Amino acid sequence: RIRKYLANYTQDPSTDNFYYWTCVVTVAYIYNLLFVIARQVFNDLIGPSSQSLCRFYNNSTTQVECTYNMLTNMKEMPTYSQYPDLGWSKYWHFRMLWVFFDLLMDCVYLIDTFLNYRMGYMDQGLVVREAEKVTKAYWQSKQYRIDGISLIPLDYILGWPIPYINWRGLPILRLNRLIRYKRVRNCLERTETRSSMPNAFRVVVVVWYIVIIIHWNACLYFWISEWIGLGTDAWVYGHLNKQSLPDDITDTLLRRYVYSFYWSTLILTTIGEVPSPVRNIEYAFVTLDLMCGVLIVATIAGNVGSMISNMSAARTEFQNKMDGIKQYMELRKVSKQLEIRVIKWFDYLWTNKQSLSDQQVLKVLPDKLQAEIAMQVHFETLRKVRIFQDCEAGLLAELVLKLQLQVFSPGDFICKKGDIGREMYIVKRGRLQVVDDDGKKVFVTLQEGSVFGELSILNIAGSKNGNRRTANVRSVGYTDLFVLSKTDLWNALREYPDARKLLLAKGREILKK
Amino acid sequence: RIRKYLANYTQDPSTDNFYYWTCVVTVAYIYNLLFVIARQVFNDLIGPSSQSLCRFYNNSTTQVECTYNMLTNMKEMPTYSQYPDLGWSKYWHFRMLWVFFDLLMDCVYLIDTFLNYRMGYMDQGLVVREAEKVTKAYWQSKQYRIDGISLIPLDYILGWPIPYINWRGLPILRLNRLIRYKRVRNCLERTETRSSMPNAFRVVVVVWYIVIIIHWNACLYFWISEWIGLGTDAWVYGHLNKQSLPDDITDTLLRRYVYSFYWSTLILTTIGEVPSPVRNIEYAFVTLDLMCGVLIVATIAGNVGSMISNMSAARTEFQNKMDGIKQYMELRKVSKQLEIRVIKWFDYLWTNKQSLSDQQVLKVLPDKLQAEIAMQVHFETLRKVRIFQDCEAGLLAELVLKLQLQVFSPGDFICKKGDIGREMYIVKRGRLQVVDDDGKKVFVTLQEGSVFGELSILNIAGSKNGNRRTANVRSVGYTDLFVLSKTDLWNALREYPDARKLLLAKGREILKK
Ligand code: NA
């Protein structure tokens, strides 16, 4: 039942469900990141706690509650008068909506702290899943410190307006929820690896960081403006700042946030098309802010330039190789015809993504994976070669390890009559044909998967032109042959002497018949 | 005839005519890219559909058709009154010109859809050209979806002013022509490879992208200005924007486009010397636009910096090598004279583009091309060596594969009397001379193509100082020798035993005579 399942449960961090969970926790973290500072600085997000009072001229001048026509074209800023119950009868629905999302994100934090409690870890290359071990490792580590500091429900008692003690609230007490940044960094690291566009995603995440910095600096600008006093000079938000409040513009919560966000965007991007500071404290703030903005712009530029140089590195390497080849062919005075042939073949290899190397797989993988990949590509082709049909699979594994790719262009000759023959060819991705001594005839056409030269790899010792090629073979279009050298065959064969004698017997048989 | 040719026709994509065709299709695409959005937002491009009416003071104030003096120094914007036939009697020539270029570019799109219908593809390294196969591959792929969506003639019925139903037109319905971007990307990819300046071309294409973005954002600025209302605040185009319409400036279609393009250039380059926004919606638009402009400037900078670092990479590598050499010669206390000699030789190798390596050709080309290049450079020189004049061409092919470049500076000695001689030298790109034991005499001068030391490569077994050099040879200026080692000769020779015995015979003969 529920008790059994929850008493036994332990988590595997490498699942996909755990990744989706880390995304849920990232959503909750981003909720806190934006809205705790927004509710601290922009108090009316939970509903106004006080009444705005404007000095209105009717017969005479008296102090009344501001309308929207009183908050347009102001000659001074309004003054505030607290409600007896700090806006609770008028805005309890707004405040219960905020409380509900607070409890939702805190329940997410509690589920996360439980999954941390029953969290499986790697030990001896395996993930440990014994409830006793995982909880003991949880307590040995000090994850519980960060888990408990991040959930202290201090904002529930002291973060809301309490009218009985005239406590106005302190939403900033929910900033301990921001200690859980490791799960968010983990989610973003995992999202980059699962991404099909890892450079683009990295730039996007930096842009998201910049937008959140601009939001926090918007809240900082407005908090500094309100601490200096709104409308007291031409730099703070207010009626003397004519970019803040132009002619027919109303002073609203939306206007305060919109102007502060625009101000912060222009300052942290070093555009600076905002009013100049007036007081020494504003000069200090703006100087520091513009130096931060210089660094922020250099960071955006560095990330974009890094992405741009990473995504053009292969074309640059190809162009370097092509330039070197052309330089060589100029210095050593090669024909124009062979030069255009070289450039055609190199351009084909580019626009078809071939790379002319198996070192991609060779170097960076472990030999187990290399052997498995090679056996999946070459083994079934190699087992039908008519001299390897009666061998043990170990020999063929060693052989599929030692196969070399050779590429040919249209009309190229693989071999010609009376040539040294010391190889065996397997046709992959092409088509060959055996032409009668002039290039205007055809005997047979070799398709993919066929084999040519398989007796020239044995040594039958008196086999009627054993070493010479005895045929002409040319490529129809671009071909991809795989070659098993004679040296490689005998090197591998010396370890299997029973397969050796049998190969010799089969070769003599095929030769005689 | 025509029917036969068109029924049989099938296209090869790798031709040069097809490249010129892709350039024609790129011209048609760029036509649509600019002019569909321009005709949507800047309606008067096809001729005004309505009459501009200005409130004029003659005796009294009445509403008359605006002149150019009424559209200068305006106190308010004019109002419009549709024509009964929506400008068709006055501007049918403009509209038929636009219709003609529309039909021209749509015929280009139809030719392109036919060439896609009969389009040859690569199969087994060959381009397939059988009409049945290419059309079957066209239908198997879903190219016909994109080809048909991009040609829906909806703009011909609903994109022009129809006065009978009071339809004002919707030029934006021609935006489905912009689905064919793959042919344009293909054309630009192919233009980069054919380019002699591939870094410059890449930067130029990014600059073209930025200019088109600035054009579309100019149209966006003016559409937003017109939707808010022209002349309603100091940010939209109009008479209250005194950068839009200064003192003696007339409100024309050219002025609207010119100002919107300048505005968009200053915003997307983050210069920002334009009026500040006034309303919340303008603040939102401009904040988003300036963040896009930050990214656009970082993109331009990244592409330029990538090009700059690619075009100075070789000089940087050379300077790294030179610095390493000088560091070594300082640590190990080499003379100043040998140090200036090393630096002179390295500077020469730089300012003459030699690279001291044949690995350029060696690594990156397939062995077929390497063998052909080596045979074209070395074979005729090697066949006149007086011991290789009576050999089979296969031996000489193997030998021209195994030739090593050695470079010498002016006055350097290739060899001296009584030195171990185990090589043969072929003079390429230089001039040697045999000096009599003091360096003040001359016996013979060896020019390009000559050969020295060709008997020291054989083993005549008692050949009167067979191993010692028996002559002094020094380089006149910078020389480029190619050396055939004795080890290489015998390694290659063991495969040809008939050529071996013959070489031995010829060497004994030359030695005796
Ligand atoms: Na300025």
- Contact at CB, B377 and A334, closer than 8 angstroms: yes
Contact predicate B392/B441, CB 8 Å: no
Is B291 in contact with B217 (CB distance < 8 Å)? Answer: no
Using alpha carbons, select from B480, B493, B487 the residue that is nearest to residue B396: B493
Which residues touch B41 (CB under 8 Å, ≥6 apart)? B219, B220, B222, B223, B226
- Whether B449 has its CB under 8 Å from any CB of chain A: the answer is no
Total residues belonging to chain B = 513
Longest distance between any two alpha carbons in chain A, whole Å: 130
Letter string b/e over residues A99-131, b meaning 16 or more CB atoms within 10 A of that residue's CB: eeebeebbebbeebbebbbbbbbeeeeeeebee
Question: Is B159 labelled as part of a ligand binding site?
Answer: no
Q: Which of A418, A473, A406 is nearest to A445 (CA)?
A: A473
CA–CA distance, A502 with A510 (Å, rounded to integer) = 12
Q: Amino acid letter at B434?
A: V
| DSSP letters spanning A381-422 | HHTTSSSSTTS-HHHHHHHHHS-EEEEE-TT-EEE-TT-B--
Beta bridge partners of A127: A122
Element of type H or E holding B360: helix B359-364
Residue at token pair 């973290």: A29
> For the sheet containing B451-452, what is the strand order?
B404-408, B479-483, B425-428, B451-452
Residue of chain B with shortest Cα separation from A407: B366
Paired tokens of B52: 């501009």
- Cβ partners under 8 Å of residue B39, min gap 6: B45, B46, B98, B171
Closest CA to B375 of B383, B363, B365, B364: B383
Asked if residues B473 and B426 have their Cβ atoms less than 8 Å apart, the reply is no
Radius of gyration of chain A (CA): 38
Q: How far apart are CA B285 and CA B289, in angstroms?
A: 6
B75 is in an annotated binding site: no
Rounded to whole angstroms, the Cα distance separating B340 from B326 reads 10
Chain A residues touching residue B353 (CB < 8 angstroms)? 327, 331
Q: Do B361 and A328 touch (CB under 8 A)?
A: yes
What is the stated resolution of the deposited model, in angstroms? Answer: 2.5
B188 contact A CB<8A: no
**Cα Rg of chain B (Å, integer):** 38
CA dist B188 → A62, B144, B191 (Å):
72, 23, 5
Do the Cβ atoms of A57 and A189 come closer than 8 Å?
A: no
User: What are the residues whose beta carbons fall under 8 Å from the beta carbon of B198, sequence distance 6 or more?
Assistant: A315, A319, B192
DSSP-derived secondary structure letter, A275: P
Q: Which residues of A touch B366 (CB under 8 A)?
A: 345, 356, 406-408
Residue A48 near residue A161, CB atoms below 8 Å? no
- Type of residue at A144: Y
Place of tokens 């449960």: A9
Q: Within a 10 A sphere around the Cβ of B176, how many other Cβ atoms?
A: 19
B351: left (phi over 0), alpha (psi -120 to 50) or beta: alpha
Q: Is B331 helix (H, G, I), strand (E, B) or coil?
A: helix
- The answer to whether B430 touches B476, Cβ cutoff 8 Å, is yes
User: B298 CA to chain A: closest CA distance, Å?
Assistant: 5
B27–A contact, CB cutoff 8 A? no
Q: Which two tokens stand for residue A324?
A: 């070197």
**If phi over 0 gives left and psi between -120 and 50 gives alpha, with beta otherwise, what is residue A229?**
left
Chain B contact for A205 (CB, 8 A cutoff): no
Residue A19: count of CB within 10 angstroms of its CB: 15
Cβ neighbours of A479 in B, within 8 Å: 125
Q: Pick A300's closest partner by Cβ from B280, B298, B377.
A: B298
Query: Going by C-beta distance under 8 Å and a sequence separation of 6 or more, which residues neighbour residue A307?
Result: A199, A200, A202, A203, B302
Contacts of A164 (CB under 8 A, 6+ apart): none
- Is the separation of the CB atoms in A509 and A387 below 8 Å? no
Q: Do B366 and A406 touch (CB under 8 A)?
A: yes
Is residue A381 left, alpha or beta, with left meaning phi > 0 and alpha meaning psi from -120 to 50?
Answer: alpha
Query: For residue B102, what are the contacts with CB-CB under 8 A and spacing of at least 6?
Result: B155, B156, B174
C-alpha–C-alpha distance, residues B412 and B476, integer Å: 8
**What letter does residue A351 receive in the DSSP assignment?**
T
Ligand 1 centre distance from Cα of residue A215 (Å): 24
Give B94-149 as a DSSP string: HHHHHHHHHHHHHHHHHHHHHHHHTB--EETTEE---HHHHHHHHHHTTHHHHHHH
| Helix locations, A246-335, DSSP H | 253-268, 280-310, 313-331
Using CA atoms, how far apart are residues A7 and A281, in angstroms rounded to an integer?
58
Calculate how close chain B gets to A310, using CA atoms only, in Å: 9
Q: Give the largest Cα separation in chain B, rounded.
A: 130
Compute CA distances A447 → A352, A376, B148, B446, whole Å.
21, 20, 38, 53
Q: Which helix or strand (DSSP H or E) is residue A427 part of? A: strand A425-428
Instruction: Tell how far the Cα of B149 is from the centroid of ligand 1, in angstroms.
Output: 47
Distance (Å) from CA B243 to ligand 1 centroid: 14
Buried b / exposed e over A34-65, threshold 16 CB at 10 Å, is: ebbbbbbbbbbbbbbbeebbbeeeeeeeeeee
SS3 B174: helix
CA distance B194 to chain A (A): 10
The CA–CA distances, whole Å, from B79 to B53, B65, B73, B220, B242 equal: 5, 10, 16, 22, 20
Length of chain A: 513
**CA separation for the pair B65, B52 (Å, rounded):** 6
Cα dist from A272 to A262, A297, A369, B276, whole Å:
11, 13, 57, 11
Rounded to whole angstroms, what are the CA distances from B146 to B142, B152, B173, B187? 7, 11, 16, 18
Put simply, the answer to whether B306 touches A309 (Cβ < 8 Å) is: yes
- Token reading at B188: 């630009």
> Counting beta carbons within 10 angstroms of the beta carbon of residue A371, is it exposed (0 to 12), middle (13 to 18) or buried (19 or more)?
middle
- The DSSP output letter for B277 is P
B406: CB partners within 8 A, 6+ apart: B480, B481, B482, B483
The verdict on A410 touching B (C-beta cutoff 8 Å) is yes
Using CB atoms within 10 Å of the CB of residue B419, give its burial: 0 to 12 exposed, 13 to 18 middle, 19+ buried. middle
- How far is the first Cα of chain A from the last one, in angstroms, to the nearest whole number? 76
Interchain CB contact of A460 with B (< 8 Å): no
User: For A361, phi and psi rounded to 5 degrees?
Assistant: -70, -40
Interface of B with A in 242-271 (CB under 8 A): 270
Question: Which region holds residue B231: left if phi is over 0, alpha if psi is between -120 and 50, else beta?
Answer: left
Query: What is the spatial distance between Cα B64 and Cα B52, in angstroms, rounded to a whole number?
Result: 8
Name the residue among B287, B305, B376 with its Cβ closest to that of A334.
B376
Q: Please name the amino acid found at residue A62.
A: T
Q: Does B306 touch chain A (CB under 8 A)?
A: yes
Candidate from A246, A407, A479 with C-beta closest to B278: A246
The CA-atom distances, in angstroms, between B406 and each of A413, B317, B423, B454, B475 are: 32, 22, 12, 17, 12
| Chain B residues with beta carbon closer than 8 angstroms to that of A265 | 287, 290-291
What is the sign of the dihedral through the CA atoms of B280, B285, B290 and B295?
positive
Q: How big is the CA angle at A59 (ends A53 and A63), to the nearest 5 degrees?
A: 10
DSSP state of A162: B
Q: Are the C-beta atoms of A401 and A505 separated by less than 8 Å?
A: no
Cα B193 from chain centroid (whole Å): 5
**E strand or H helix at B3:** helix B2-8
Q: If you count residue pairs, one on A and one on B, with CB atoms under 8 Å apart, how many are there?
A: 144
Contact status, residue B346 vs residue B324, Cβ threshold 8 Å: no
Q: Is residue B192 a known part of a binding site?
A: no
Residue A260 alpha carbon to ligand 1 centre in Å = 19
Strand, helix or coil at B357? Answer: coil
Beta pairing partners, B250: B72
Q: List phi, psi (to 5°) of B202.
A: -65, -45
CA of A75 to the centre of ligand 1 (A): 27
**Closest alpha carbon to A332 in B488, B409, B400, B422:** B400
- HSE-CB at A400 with a 13 A cutoff on CA atoms is 22
Query: Which of A209, A304, A456, A486 to probe the B interface (max B CBs under 10 A)?
Result: A304
Evaluate whether B123 touches B134 at the Cβ level (below 8 Å).
Answer: no
- Kindly tell me the burial class for residue A479, based on how many C-beta atoms sit within 10 Å of its own C-beta (0-12, 13-18, 19 or more): buried
A325 touches chain B (CB under 8 A): yes
Asked if A308 and B306 come within 8 Å (Cβ–Cβ), the reply is yes
Please choose, from the candidates A235, A500, A488, the residue with its C-alpha nearest in 3D space to the C-alpha of residue A390: A500
For residue B489, the cross-strand partners are: none
d(CA A330, CA B373): 12
Task: Decide if A118 contacts A134 (C-beta within 8 A).
Answer: yes
The string of DSSP letters for B412-428 reads -EEE-TT-B----EEEE
DSSP string, A211-230: HHHHHHHHHHHHHHHHHH-T
Q: Is B366 on the interface with A (CB under 8 A)?
A: yes
| Other beta carbons within 10 Å of A277 | 17
How many whole angstroms from its chain centre is CA B56? 58
Q: Is B441 annotated as a binding residue?
A: no
Q: Do residue B394 and residue A419 have CB atoms under 8 angstroms apart?
A: yes
